[PDB]
Amino acid sequence: MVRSISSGKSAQFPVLGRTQAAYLAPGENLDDKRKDIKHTEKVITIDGL
Amino acid sequence: MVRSISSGKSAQFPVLGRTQAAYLAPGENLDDKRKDIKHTEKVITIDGL
Amino acid sequence: LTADVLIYDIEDAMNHYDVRSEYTSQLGESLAMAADGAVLAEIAGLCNVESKYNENIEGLGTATVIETTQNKAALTDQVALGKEIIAALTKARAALTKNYVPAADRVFYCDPDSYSAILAALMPNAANYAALIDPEKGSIRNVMGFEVVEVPHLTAGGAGTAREGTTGQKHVFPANKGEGNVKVAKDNVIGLFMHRSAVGTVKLRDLALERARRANFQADQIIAKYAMGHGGLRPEAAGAVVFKV
Amino acid sequence: AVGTVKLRDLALERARRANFQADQIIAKYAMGHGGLRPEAAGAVVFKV
Amino acid sequence: ESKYNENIEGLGTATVIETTQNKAALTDQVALGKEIIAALTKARAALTKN
Amino acid sequence: ESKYNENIEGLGTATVIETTQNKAALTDQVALGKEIIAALTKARAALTKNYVPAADRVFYCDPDSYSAILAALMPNAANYAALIDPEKGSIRNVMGFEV
Amino acid sequence: ASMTGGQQMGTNQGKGVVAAGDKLALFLKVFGGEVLTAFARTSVTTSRH
Numbered sequence: 001m002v003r004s005i006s007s008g009k010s011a012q013f014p015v016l017g018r019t020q021a022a023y024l025a026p027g028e029n030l031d032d033k034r035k036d037i038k039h040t041e042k043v044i045t046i047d048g049l
Numbered sequence: 050m051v052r053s054i055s056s057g058k059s060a061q062f063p064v065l066g067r068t069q070a071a072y073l074a075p076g077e078n079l080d081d082k083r084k085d086i087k088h089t090e091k092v093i094t095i096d097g098l
Numbered sequence: 099l100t101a102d103v104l105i106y107d108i109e110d111a112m113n114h115y116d117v118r119s120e121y122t123s124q125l126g127e128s129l130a131m132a133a134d135g136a137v138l139a140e141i142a143g144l145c146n147v148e149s150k151y152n153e154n155i156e157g158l159g160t161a162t163v164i165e166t167t168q169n170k171a172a173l174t175d176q177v178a179l180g181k182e183i184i185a186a187l188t189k190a191r192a193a194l195t196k197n198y199v200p201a202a203d204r205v206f207y208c209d210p211d212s213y214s215a216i217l218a219a220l221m222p223n224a225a226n227y228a229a230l231i232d233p234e235k236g237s238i239r240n241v242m243g244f245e246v247v248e249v250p251h252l253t254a255g256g257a258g259t260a261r262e263g264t265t266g267q268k269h270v271f272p273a274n275k276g277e278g279n280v281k282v283a284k285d286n287v288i289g290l291f292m293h294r295s296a297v298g299t300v301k302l303r304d305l306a307l308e309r310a311r312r313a314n315f316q317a318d319q320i321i322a323k324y325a326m327g328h329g330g331l332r333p334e335a336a337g338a339v340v341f342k343v
Numbered sequence: 344a345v346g347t348v349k350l351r352d353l354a355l356e357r358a359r360r361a362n363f364q365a366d367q368i369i370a371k372y373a374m375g376h377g378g379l380r381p382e383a384a385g386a387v388v389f390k391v
Numbered sequence: 392e393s394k395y396n397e398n399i400e401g402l403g404t405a406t407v408i409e410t411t412q413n414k415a416a417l418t419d420q421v422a423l424g425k426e427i428i429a430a431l432t433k434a435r436a437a438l439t440k441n
Numbered sequence: 442e443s444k445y446n447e448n449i450e451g452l453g454t455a456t457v458i459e460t461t462q463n464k465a466a467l468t469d470q471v472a473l474g475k476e477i478i479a480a481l482t483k484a485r486a487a488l489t490k491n492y493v494p495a496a497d498r499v500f501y502c503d504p505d506s507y508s509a510i511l512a513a514l515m516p517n518a519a520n521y522a523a524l525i526d527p528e529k530g531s532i533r534n535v536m537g538f539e540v
Numbered sequence: 541a542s543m544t545g546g547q548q549m550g551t552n553q554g555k556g557v558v559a560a561g562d563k564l565a566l567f568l569k570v571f572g573g574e575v576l577t578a579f580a581r582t583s584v585t586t587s588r589h
Contacts, residue, residue, distance in 0.1 A: 010569035017578020019128035020261040022100040035261035040448045050346025058112040083545030093377025097108045115575045134583045214486030222523040234534040249584045250490045313358035385405025387430045389412040396555045492579040
């Protein structure tokens with residue numbers, strides 16, 4: 001796979017994934033327990049002509 | 050001012066200036082001497098909400 | 099069972115990629131995976147970890163296949179493992195036949211590595227003559243009455259309580275054979291073999307997606323949840339091939 | 344000399360909260376204020 | 392700022408200390424105005440220079 | 442990299458190690474192909490857990506080791522004919538790979 | 541023969557930044573042409589249920 005950008009010197013891509021489901025019952029608030037989908041981004045750089 | 054950007058977090062604007070106007074002798078080389086142009090950027094960051 | 103994403107408004111403002119669809123897909127996938135793992139762990143555990151009870155009387159046997167030779171951790175070999183998996187599979191057919199149940203469909207569940215062993219046992223180097231498996235993009239095919247799926251996520255899947263794996267769980271794979279009088283421990287697992295009609299799944303309220311807007315944080319959030327119960331019935335149609343110690 | 348960079352500009356939104364049997368109105372913006380061309384900005388102070 | 396001027400020594404920063412002035416010594420209402428005016432003159436000069 | 446897999450337990454790259462000893466202890470060349478086949482199956486396995494589409498995988502070798510793979514297969518000795526094709530040594534695939 | 545006064549569109553100069561380590565250096569690293577998701581995993585059931 002190849003991609004084409006114009007102008008800017010470096011092209012950054014973002015990567016992300018995975019959750020965990022949960023159990024709640026009749027009378028407990030949801031907001032108490034939650035895990036954010038941790039997302040990390042990876043950067044590519046142009047070397048020269 | 051009041052210039053407005055969408056999407057991204059922070060905006061930078063570059064600055065540059067001045068030249069020494071040249072007196073070119075006849076049948077003689079300009080290519081040898083250029084001052085060039087001085088280049089500098091300045092960036093502003095936004096605080097949330 | 100719940101799925102949850104809460105996205106701030108300021109972070110959505112300066113982000114330059116929509117990320118909604120990806121989050122929804124992520125949620126659906128999460129719920130599904132939980133559902134699957136819960137079932138696998140259910141059949142293995144609840145039918146090879148219980149003591150003194152086999153449903154009805156003489157209705158079933160609940161057999162569990164031990165591995166030939168010394169402890170497999172000692173064999174530390176690629177191929178030969180394949181031999182043992184083949185033998186074990188023959189024996190499995192022997193049990194599931196010894197206790198009636200139609201010849202088809204049935205099935206087999208191993209982990210990808212053991213599947214690789216099964217694949218390696220029938221190769222040009224060893225042994226002789228053509229085989230059921232095709233070399234190159236090896237799909238195997240069948241071992242008598244089995245489909246050999248080779249799923250990547252065996253163990254766990256019980257879900258429960260906190261988002262972190264450790265804590266209250268509804269279905270579990272114990273850590274050892276000695277500890278709790280259980281035999282199909284987490285380390286001890288090559289394959290599980292069930293007929294089908296050998297595990298129950300009960301569905302009410304199905305699964306649904308809905309989003310809500312919460313003014314207090316300026317942030318709106320998608321939620322996707324569902325409710326259903328998993329259980330096991332008829333252990334004669336269930337067994338498991340297991341490491342030895 | 345100095346400029347303000349604004350995103351989302353300024354708007355206002357009205358939401359209903361049921362538990363207090365009342366609604367609340369809320370308006371926000373999001374801006375950043377930087378300072379540039381510092382040579383062309385001076386000030387007058389007294390001190391000895 | 393501290394040395395951090397901008398775009399080399401080509402262009403220069405500005406500041407006006409008020410002359411022979413202590414706020415406690417001033418507050419004359421008349422002297423103050425005079426002083427702010429003079430400071431303003433030097434201010435315009437400095438600004439125009441760059 | 443000493444450590445580091447991006448996005449913890451997103452995934453973690455695998456480098457299949459060789460069974461047997463150093464090159465000085467190999468280079469018979471008939472055995473190298475054996476080792477490449479085994480390592481290739483194990484690689485298909487290492488890649489298969491962790492997901493990634495079954496379609497479109499690709500393998501990069503070099504002339505030497507390719508001829509070695511050509512040496513593991515062949516009459517003597519590799520039993521039933523299988524994948525490889527003589528008259529040029531073009532390999533169809535192995536486990537879901539182009540070569 | 542190498543030519544000086546190249547212009548150096550990117551590079552900072554400034555009054556004080558000194559160092560002059562690297563060049564370009566200044567610019568922007570921008571990409572929005574592609575978002576990268578975690579690999580989709582399927583489910584082995586229902587079917588065999």
